Structures are given as structure tokens and as C-alpha cells.
């Protein structure tokens, strides 16, 4: 049968980038032509494979990761990138084989007064390994003194909200991202 790419791209709600979702796609025939033959993608960057010739090379496994990030953070969803998202939320390996797909979701995910449900990790003691997922809400110590799970001063809660509002500039608007790994 056919692969469930509609379940991923057309989902009513996307995950926060710190808790990015991963759907393992197995035992199906993928119709990749329709995906690229869509003008509604503002980012469609493939690495190691050509988007037109997606069904001509070897298939390790097919993973579909999805989340929502800021507009000016889309440039971090790529190999070798640094920044808050690539270091502390979602990291692509240097030898990445797949495609990064993103589109503006301002009319879906931003609310008047702020949609605070979408979060990202702002602090961490070390960068994430490729494809590592971190959902811990332990208090982060930025100073010399311990915190003992208490929030204050140089002790920060590690997660921050985007608070998407539709009147934000495009750099702060929500973007839905789908990473296809092969």
C-alpha cells in the first residue's frame, strides 16, 4: 500500500521542537513525486539525494520528524549548524541523508494574544548528539551556586515559549518542519 505522508504533513497539531515527534515509516510504497510537486513549501532542502530522484537510491530506513520553530531558526535545521535549536533541541548529523521541508504556519499555530503551547529548550550543559531528544524539565544552573530544583536568580527553567502571535514579523512566526531521513 501507500505510505502515510498525509498523517505527517497535514497533522492538525505539531509537536514542540524540544519534544520533536518521530514517525517510523515502514512497509509501504512512498509517492515522493507529489511532495516536491507542491509549490506550498518555502524550504525544501535535500542532502545526499536529489529531490526529483528520491526513489532511485538505497533505503536505510525512512523516518519523518516534525516540530514547530521560529522563522529565523529554519536555517538551523541543517548539517553543521550551530544555535539554540541545533545545539539544544534538534541536531542533524554531518553525514545527513534526507530532506528538510518547512512552511509558514502563521495562520494555523499563532493566536491573538499568543499561542504559548509551542516550546523550545533555551539552556543545556552540552550540545545534543545527532537525533538526540531531551524533554527533561530539570532546573538549569548558570552560576556557581546549586539550585536544588528551585527556580531563581542564575537558575533557569530550561524551556521557553515562542508565544506565537500572527502580527509577529516573519522571523518570529511559526514554521512547521518535516525532516525525512533515509
Amino acid at each position, epitope marked *: 500500500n501507500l505510505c502515510p505522508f498525509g498523517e505527517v504533513f497535514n497533522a492538525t497539531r505539531f509537536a514542540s521542537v524540544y519534544a520533536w515527534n518521530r514517525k517510523r515509516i515502514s512497509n509501504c510504497v512512498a509517492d515522493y513525486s507529489v511532495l516536491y510537486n507542491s509549490a506550498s513549501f518555502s524550504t525544501f532542502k535535500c542532502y545526499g539525494v536529489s529531490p526529483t530522484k528520491l526513489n532511485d537510491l538505497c533505503f536505510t530506513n525512512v523516518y519523518a520528524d516534525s516540530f514547530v520553530i521560529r522563522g529565523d531558526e529554519v536555517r538551523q535545521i541543517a548539517p553543521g549548524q550551530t544555535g539554540n535549536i541545533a545545539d539544544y533541541n534538534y541536531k542533524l548529523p554531518d553525514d545527513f541523508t534526507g530532506c528538510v521541508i518547512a512552511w509558514n504556519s502563521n495562520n494555523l499555530d499563532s493566536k491573538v494574544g499568543g499561542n504559548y503551547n509551542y516550546l523550545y529548550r533555551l539552556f543545556r550543559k552540552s550540545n545534543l548528539k545527532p537525533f538526540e531528544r531531551d524533554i527533561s524539565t530539570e532546573i538549569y544552573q*548558570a*552560576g*556557581s*551556586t*546549586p539550585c*536544588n530544583g*528551585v527556580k*531563581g536568580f*542564575n537558575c533557569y527553567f530550561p524551556l521557553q515559549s515562542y508565544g506565537f502571535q500572527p502580527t509577529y514579523g516573519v522571523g518570529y512566526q511559526p514554521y512547521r518542519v518535516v525532516v525525512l531521513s533515509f
Partner: antibody
Framework: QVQLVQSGAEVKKPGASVKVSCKAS????????ISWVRQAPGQGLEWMGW????????HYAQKLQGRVTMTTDTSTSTAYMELRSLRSDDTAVYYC????????????WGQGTLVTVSS | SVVTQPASVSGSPGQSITISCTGTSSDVGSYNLVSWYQQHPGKAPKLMIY???KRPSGVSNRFSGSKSGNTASLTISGLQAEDEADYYC??????????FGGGTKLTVLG
């Protein structure tokens, strides 16, 4: 020995500003925070705010926002407290203390600086 | 001050007294971060208790701290003449804010 030594007493008129220094020695100045606490004559202790000389982060008491500025000079291990728009009820002894941040203690304290605000 | 202490307490040389420190659920009853300070006339406050019940290196074991609910207590056993001073409790209140109690004048009837 850990010691904090503050600037001399100051006499100010209403509307003026005062800047009190707090020179630290005997410990790693950046390994702890500095907090400022004042005490009106015959009254109790009032926490003014905290500043971390490590990263420069500050936080002040709600009744002092927009009126107090705390700074540090890491090179000389000196914290400063600036209080503008002085009014008569700001007459107090202004203490600094080595803040243990979230460890929950103030130790040791500076000797204090008398600031008399009078018309 | 959201934290309330008795204005005055007195005792005789030898007895034990308790200084209460009553706050709300969002300060005293929310964190084990209650510290106590002894201040003699014209002198800077001195740390006596931190983290509710811990003593720093140098403080006599006659001073102890405890907490029940939203009320912290400082207990001095075997009162001496140098124990007479003002005592202040200080607690974390969340949001990077400390709050002191009103203070309690302890008199040692001597």
C-alpha cells in the same frame, strides 16, 4: 578572611541620588552573588535586590524598580548600589552582603553606610 | 512584609525561648530557604541559621531552627546575656525575591 568594606556616610537632599560602593576581598568575587539590604533608623531589614558579578544579572525589589541600579566591577571586586530620586524615607543604613544565591544565606555582611536624606 | 514576627520576646538567663516567623504558602511553606540573622545595636546582622535548620561554622549549638507549615521557628536554649539582640528571619518568595520578617526584639532579663 572574607570581608566587605563600604563607602562613607552620605547626606543628601530630596531628589538627589547616592552611589554606595562595596569592595570585596578574601574570596572569589564572581563565585557568589551580592545582595543589598537597607534598614531605616529603628526599623527592620529590607531586601533591596541582588546582582551577580559573574554574569551581571540583576533583580530588584518590587518597590524599587526603575529607581535602583546595581553594578559590579569584576576587575576591582567592587559592587555598587545607585539609588536615584531620593526621598526622606530613604534615610537608612545600606548594607551589602555576599549572597549565596539559591543556597539561602547572606554571609558575611558589610559594615554599612548611613545615607541621611533630609530637606 | 508578608512575613510576620512577634514584636518582642523576653526570657531569663537559663530558659529557652522560641521566635516564630509566620509567612504564606508561597514563601515559608514553599521552600526550605529560611535563614535567621542576629543583629546587635549598631552592628551588621550575622548569619545564625540557613536552610531552615543548618548552622554555619562558628554559631553556637544553642541556636536551632525548625518549620511547621508556613511558620519557621528559631529556638535559643540556655539564654545568655550576649543573646539579647534583634532577630530577623529571611525566606525565598519565588521569582528571585527574598523577604525579611519584621524582626523580634529579644530581651534577656539580667
Amino acid at each position: 578572611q572574607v570581608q566587605l568594606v563600604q563607602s562613607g556616610a552620605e547626606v543628601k537632599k530630596p531628589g538627589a541620588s547616592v552611589k554606595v560602593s562595596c569592595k570585596a576581598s578574601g574570596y572569589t568575587f564572581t563565585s557568589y552573588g551580592i545582595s543589598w539590604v537597607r534598614q531605616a533608623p529603628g526599623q527592620g531589614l529590607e531586601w533591596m535586590g541582588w546582582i551577580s558579578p559573574y554574569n551581571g544579572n540583576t533583580h530588584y525589589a518590587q518597590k524599587l524598580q526603575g529607581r535602583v541600579t546595581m553594578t559590579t566591577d569584576t576587575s576591582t571586586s567592587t559592587a555598587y548600589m545607585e539609588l536615584r530620586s531620593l526621598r526622606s524615607d530613604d534615610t537608612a543604613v545600606y548594607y551589602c552582603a555576599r549572597d549565596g544565591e539559591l543556597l539561602g544565606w547572606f554571609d558575611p555582611w558589610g559594615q554599612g553606610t548611613l545615607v541621611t536624606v533630609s530637606s | 512584609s508578608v512575613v510576620t514576627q512577634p514584636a518582642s520576646v523576653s526570657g531569663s538567663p537559663g530558659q529557652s525561648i522560641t521566635i516564630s516567623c509566620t509567612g504564606t504558602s508561597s514563601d515559608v511553606g514553599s521552600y526550605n530557604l529560611v535563614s535567621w540573622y542576629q543583629q546587635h545595636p549598631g552592628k551588621a546582622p550575622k548569619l545564625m541559621i540557613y536552610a531552615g535548620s543548618k548552622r554555619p561554622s562558628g554559631v553556637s549549638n544553642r541556636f536551632s531552627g525548625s518549620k511547621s507549615g508556613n511558620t519557621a521557628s528559631l529556638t535559643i536554649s540556655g539564654l545568655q546575656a550576649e543573646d539579647e539582640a534583634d532577630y530577623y528571619c529571611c525566606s525565598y518568595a519565588g521569582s528571585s525575591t527574598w523577604v525579611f520578617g519584621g524582626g523580634t526584639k529579644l530581651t534577656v532579663l539580667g
